[PDB]
Every structure is written in C-alpha cells, then in structure tokens.
Amino acid sequence: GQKVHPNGIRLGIVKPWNSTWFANTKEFADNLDSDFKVRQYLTKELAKASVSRIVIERPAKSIRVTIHTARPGIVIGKKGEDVEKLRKVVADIAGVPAQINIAEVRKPELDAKLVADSITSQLERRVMFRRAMKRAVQNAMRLGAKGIKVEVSGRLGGAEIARTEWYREGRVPLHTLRADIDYNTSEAHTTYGVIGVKVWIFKGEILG
Amino acid sequence: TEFLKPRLVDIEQVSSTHAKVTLEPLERGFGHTLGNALRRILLSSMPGCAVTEVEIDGVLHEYSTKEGVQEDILEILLNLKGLAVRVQGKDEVILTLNKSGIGPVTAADITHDGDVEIVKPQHVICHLTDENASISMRIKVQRGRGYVPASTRIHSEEDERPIGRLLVDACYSPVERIAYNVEAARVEQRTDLDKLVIEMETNGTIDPEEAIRRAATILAEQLEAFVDLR
Amino acid sequence: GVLKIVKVYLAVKRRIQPGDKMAGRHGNKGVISKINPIEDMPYDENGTPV
Amino acid sequence: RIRIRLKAFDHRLIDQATAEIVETAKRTGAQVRGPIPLPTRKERFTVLISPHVNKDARDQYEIRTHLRLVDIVEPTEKTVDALMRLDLAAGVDVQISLG
Amino acid sequence: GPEEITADIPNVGEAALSKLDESGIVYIGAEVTGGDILVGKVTPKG
RNA sequence: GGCUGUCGUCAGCUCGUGUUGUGAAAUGUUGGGUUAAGUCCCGCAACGAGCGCAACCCUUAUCCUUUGUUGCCAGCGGUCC
C-alpha cells in the first residue's frame, strides 16, 4: 500500500478541507456523523446529476451545504423546487436549519472525481475499459490539464485473473506538494465484481 | 510668480444632502478652470455604494408577481436601485429585510449591521397588503464608480454565483448635481481675486469635503503624468 | 396531428443605444446618435443638465 | 471589560476574524486592548493504517486549535451591540465575556 | 420514427444539459442568450 | 474492490520520434569525470519527455515587526517579601 493520498498530504497547503467548521471535543463526533449522513444522502439523491464535491460548513447552529456539480439544472430542477426539497431533508438529517448552495463546475472533464464516475458508469454499461480510459485521458488533455493519470483495477473484461492497467498523459507530479493534484476514486459494481477506478488530474503548480 | 493658494474656508450645510462649499482665495482667471475641472471629475468619478444583487425567496424571475404586495417585482427593483447606503469598513456587504403585516415597507425596516448606515428612513419599497403575507429579501451592496450595467455584468462576474439572484443595474455615483460660481472675493488688500462657490447635491452618503479632497487627488495624480514625464 | 408542442416565452429587455429611433409628436424623427455622459451635457446656471 | 476568545483550526481564518472584530470595536468604541495570541492546542492522534495487521505502519494526525484573546476595555452603548448583528466567518468559534 | 425530447443531446458535450432538467426542456427563468439550448428535441437514425 | 506490508526512501523504471538489426531486440539509459541521487558537467545516432532524485510542505536551530493577559517583571513606587 505504497502511496500517500494526494488530497490528504496537501490539505495544509494547496488543497482545502470539505467539512469546514470548529467544534469542541463534546460536539465534534456528532458533527462528523451528521456530515457523513448528509453527504451519503446527497450521493444517493444526486447520482444522475454529476456531483463532484459536497462542502459542509456550519456556523451558529445552522448547516450550510455547498454542492459542486457539473449540471446545476438537474439538481435545481425548476427554479427553487428541487433545491428547496433537498434542504428540508438535509435539515432533518442534521437537526438544524439548512442552507443549500450549488456551485457550477466549469469543465467536468478536468474534475477528477466526475471523470472517475463517468468511467465507472461506462464500465457498468459494458464498454471496453481501455477505450473508456483513453477517452478520459484524451478529453482532459484537450481541455487543458497539465497532466492526467487514470488507473483501473480488477476483473477487467470479466477475466478470472484480476489485473490493473493505467494510462498517464502529460506530467502528474505527486511528490511535489505545491502541485494542484485533483485526485479521486470510484467503484464499478459489475457482474464479475468490483472495478476500482483512480484518477489523478494535475491542474498546475501554485506559487505563494 | 506672485501666485497664491486656496483653502476651504466655510463649509455650510443647507440640508443633509444639498450643501454648498466655498474656496478661497483663487487667482485671476483660475475660477472657471478649477470649477469646470472639479465639476467634470465630481460628476464622473466618485465612489459610492449601491444595490447590485437582490435575492427574494420564492421567486423565479423579475417579471413575476408576489403574494401580498403592491409594487410588482420590477417596481421593487427600481425602488431598490434608488437606495442610498453608506458602508464604512467593508466593500461588499449583505443586508436583510424581513417584514410581515399590513402597511408600507420603509427602508428603515432593514435589519442593519454595525458598519452599514441607511441614510433614508422614509424610502418606500413595498406596500404589504395581506397580513398573512411576508417578504424576505437579501440585498448585496458592492462599491465602485461610474455606471456598470446588467448586460456587461452578465459574463464579467467571475465568482460563479448560483441561479435565482436577480441582477440590478449599478448606479454607483452618489453625486447628482453640482454647480460652481465665481464671485468677487472680499480680500482686504486685493481686488483681483475671486472665490469659488461649489454647490453640490449628493446622495446623502458622501461627505462634501471628502469628495472635494478625493477629486483634487484624482486631478493631481492625473497631472503628475504631465509634471514628471515631460 | 401535431405531436410535441413546447412553446417557450423569452423576454428580452432592450434599453436604448446609438442607432435606435426616437420621435416627438410633431413629426421630428431622429436616430439617437451619441449617448453622452452626464458631465458633457449643456447645463444651465441652476446646475441641471439637459 | 469584554474578553473575547476566538478559537479555530485554520490560523489565517482566525487572524482574519480577529482583525474584523478589532475593526468593529475600534470605530464604535475606544481603546481596544489588542489581539493577544494564546498557546495553540496541537491535539495529536496515532492510528494503525492497515485494515488488519501491520503495527509499525502508522499515520500521525493532529488538529491545531488556535486561540486569539481580544479584549475591549470600555464597553459603550454602540460598541457591544454592534457585535450582535456582526457575525464572523464560519469555522471560527468566538466567546465574548464582559467582566 | 418520431423525434425526441431528451437532454441526452449528442456529439455536443457538457454544453447541452445546462439550462434544462434531467428529462429535457429549458428549466424556466435563467439569463439565456444566443446559441443556448431550450428544448432538447432530436431523433436517432435521422 | 478498497486498505496494508514488503524489497526499499533502494536509484532506478519507462515512453515518444528518429536510428540499427530478418528479428527477439538494441540506442537513448552506455563512455570520462562527478554526486546522496538517471545529482551535475563533458562527449556520443540519437533528440526529447515522464514517473521517479531534488525542490515545494511540517518541525527544529538565529534574528526582526506586530501584539502583551490567565503570560513576563528589566526599570520604577508600594509592600503581607
């Protein structure tokens, strides 16, 4: 289990946190649990909507969710009909006043998580994994990624002996802390088993 | 070189908005020069805060209508575009207006923060007629200059905002009317000097000596390109 | 006959610009040429621009 | 005197908050004491990173809780109330205490 | 065959599915301009 | 699938285009020097690129500015020292 998590190593420097609140040792665990719940719910709901990052932020006994999604239109539905619906359920989950914001993700081919999800979907609907991977890589490159890597693993083409294959393009420096490396993962629950998809997308280096 | 320098001698406030100011003493012929230059700068380039984005709850577009009110939503956006706000510390604040009950909605009903000052407590916005009606709008007040309209601010805005925020045009300049007069100065030994009587008419949010100081700094830093380089 | 019948109502808000046509009630046609700033307008001695 | 205890995980954020609070204080009232930095709590955690067994395999995390002690010496009418409407940025637990 | 009202707009990428719902058609309100999509209305084998 | 150890924090592992060979393949990546390092120089049918060897991060060792309580007492007055 060689490698360090690319997001996790960079949280202090170039990457920010998702859950962004303060709490004392008393209420912290509970808060975490709540976050887990709400996030889980959101994932369940907005599966068909291309959702990248849920950012929870709770000040003053009131939860502020921020959903980063590629297509707001399907998450919002009719203007303030679906969002509103989501909100009350979120509140219920939390046990506090809820507030949902929806950030529009520019360039969903450069968002790593989204790409991974797409790949997983493709796998599920029985495409050639390799072709999917290629598409993922190519598209990102076209869009202006300084580099991208993707990796898929296990029961590829329903083969008895599992293996991993991966496509890199451009440069993807992981040891370099200041590199904006959007990393994320997904899992294709195929007929032969799970197929795990990792993808690293290098936006560029930050100078500060 | 037998020239002199002017000072702001007497600053009278005729009201809270309409207020004159003298300038003394000016040299011969300089009166119309400084008056016209300060007029052009004081009408074009003053910083003032104004309403930019209005966020009403349970709304789709600005051409709809709402439950319990008189003015329609375009009328509300016009009456909010006329608002006169004076922030001190920040350059971008968010106010809140919440009110229910039968009667008009003044500007004095906005739940103010500490560093925002609404200088028109009789500015009407809505006329709530149903006692079961409510209205909860969240205004956003930026700070700039000139005139920046909704069409240009349709793609200029970088911070990806969510959909549902009505965009109001930005009338940033708080100066509306300015006139200067070149009288004859009452100098005890000179007869060839004059005074400049600038008669401002503000939005109530700008302080006239501060406005004149800022316009003077704008003119001096523009002329430094002539002074230093050639 | 007709199957899918979706009518969408846009509403453009057009302001005024160099090139529109204004007119009074007397036959004085005009194509609005320059949209001047407030400062460059001819102001009377009271201060109001025209 | 109003003692104010700012607590947060992000230091920059905390700093920002403190400045804001000072600003709020200083316009209304007079003689703000100052933003005094107390000691930071570095609450350390070790965990085994293997699912099953490998004990020398470990990750050592920490949460740096920063403290910012702001004090206000003269509570006026205008000043204290200004804070009620003036909420600070999220992820910064404030704790005002007069006397 | 008949034509179809679906967002699953082709060739064109993440620049079709935007001012609409998951089942197609413009989602109401919005600051639409020129070159946008209002009603996804395209057939297969056309 | 996910997560983990391991050789081994070992200096290695590769790709493109080009070149050679019927080809498996080779070159690059070898050679003189150098270094912790495929670290750097010089040449060279190679030219380039990437992952890696480094750096970016944390901590610690010196100094400065800021801001001084629940922290400190140099100088001052008091003292229950």
UniProtKB/Swiss-Prot annotation, chain C:
Known role: DNA-dependent RNA polymerase catalyzes the transcription of DNA into RNA using the four ribonucleoside triphosphates as substrates.
Assembly notes: The RNAP catalytic core consists of 2 alpha, 1 beta, 1 beta' and 1 omega subunit. When a sigma factor is associated with the core the holoenzyme is formed, which can initiate transcription.
Family: Belongs to the RNA polymerase beta chain family.
The protein, known as: DNA-directed RNA polymerase subunit beta
Residues of the full protein shown: 1045 to 1094 of 1342
